[PDB]
């Protein structure tokens, strides 16, 4: 172990990867949510290009 | 012609500067060269 990397939502390593809309509803996640952001201390952070 | 105006020119007038952007001399003539194009 060397640390913890924040994970961008709906990436290939987020747990919401490739989940159908039903399973996203079961996890109380909006299927229309595009993702593309991190959760840092509960705050949704987006990196501006 | 093209002469500086607006707030840059007003700035330079109140911010007295040794370097005008568009310094000029509206120089007049008095003899026949005032009316003669060739002489002017």
């Amino acid at each position: 172990f060397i640390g913890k990397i924040p994970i961008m939502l709906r990436s290939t390593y987020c747990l919401l990867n490739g989940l159908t809309d039903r399973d996203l509803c079961e996890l109380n996640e909006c299927p229309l949510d595009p993702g593309g952001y991190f959760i840092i201390n509960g705050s949704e952070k987006v990196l501006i290009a | 012609k093209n002469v500086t105006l607006g707030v840059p020119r007003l700035k330079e007038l109140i911010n007295i500067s040794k370097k005008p952007k568009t310094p000029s001399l509206t120089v007049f003539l008095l003899g026949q060269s005032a009316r003669d194009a060739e002489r002017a």
Binding site: - | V7, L10, K11, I14, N15
Partner: protein, 48 residues
């Protein structure tokens, strides 16, 4: 039209090139509004 003379009225609607050149024209209006506000007060405060 190549150098940005738009020929359609606002009623007729602009073409894509015409629309993009018009957006270019309005961008200078926005930027000069911004710089005017940037120079708002400075000349006036110096004068007073």
């Amino acid at each position: 039209e190549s150098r940005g003379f738009v020929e359609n009225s606002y009623l007729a609607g602009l073409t894509p090139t015409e629309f993009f050149f018009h957006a270019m024209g309005g961008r200078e209006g926005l930027i000069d509004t911004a710089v005017k506000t940037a120079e708002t007060g400075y000349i006036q405060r110096r004068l007073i």
